[model samples]
Target: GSSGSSGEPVLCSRTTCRAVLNPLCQVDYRAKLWACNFCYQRNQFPPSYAGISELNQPA
Candidate 1:
């Protein structure tokens, strides 16, 4: 499997990138913080999840 993602979408991704939802991760898409199963890091929510609109135009 090949994985390559830069991050950029309709909404914010992070510092300034919203990783596309096309590729969903394990701790992804869960409009909630994710605590690593072996680490003490809590991943924040996705970029476009802030004010989820009824549409899916990315931006």
Candidate 2:
């Protein structure tokens, strides 16, 4: 399958892991947070992610 590219990619806050956001990752739209599928670490969304939704998800 083909994948689309984005100019700005959202990355995990964990500097140790530095995992990239993907479709398989879990998210809490209500809490404005996301979990890294690679490290299984929960990350708080930045202010820019305030308006994120399923339709326009990063992955």
Candidate 3:
């Protein structure tokens, strides 16, 4: 998808951003955001996320 396009990339929104494609993500599509399960901080999700699964995206 476009989100996986070549470049610096709009990665996740936390220190534990992806901390691995974890189940602790608690993704909220309604708010278009997610929390760092380890930190409990809310992180916004990019628009392209709808097509690009928030996992296995290696830089």
Candidate 4:
């Protein structure tokens, strides 16, 4: 059984996961992703604001 927070839609694709998690790593979205204070503190990846948001934007 999965014990992680479940509210936002599940991301099944690597592209989506990377896209969401990468940008989220930098800003307030990081907190939103995990939805747990403890999980947020345990995050390993740092946010990449410039590259993540810039390169992944809709064309």
- Model 1 Cα displacement at 5 (Å)? 12
* lDDT (Cα, tens digit) per residue for candidate 4, span 1-59: 23544434322234423333433333344453332232243233333333444234732
Model 3 C-alpha lDDT per residue in residues 10-55, reported as the tens digit of each score: 5445555545434456767587666666766777655454344444
Deviating ranges (above 4 Å) for candidate 1: 1-31, 49-59
The sequence of per-residue lDDT tens digits that candidate 1 reaches over residues 6-42 is 3334332343334333323334335555334333334
Single out the weakest 10-residue window by summed lDDT for candidate 2: 46-55
Maximum-lDDT candidate: 2
lDDT of 4 at 24: 39
Q: What TM value does model 3 have?
A: 0.48
lDDT of 2 by residue, 1-59 (tens): 12454344577888988887767778877876778898888987554543345327555
Candidate closer to the true structure by lDDT (higher is better), 3 or 4 = 3
Q: Deviation in angstroms for 10 in model 1?
A: 16
Each model's lDDT: 0.38, 0.68, 0.54, 0.35
Candidate with more favorable, higher lDDT: 1 or 4: 1
Among all candidates shown, the one with the greatest TM-score: 2
Residue 58 shift from truth in candidate 3, angstroms:
19
User: Which pairs in model 3 have colliding backbones?
Assistant: none
TM-score, one value per model: 0.26, 0.59, 0.48, 0.17
Ranked by lDDT, the better of candidates 1 and 2 is 2
TM-score of structure candidate 1: 0.26
List pairs with backbone clashes in candidate 2. none
lDDT of 4: 0.35
For candidate 4, the clash count comes to 2
- Rank ordering of all candidates by lDDT, starting from the highest: 2, 3, 1, 4
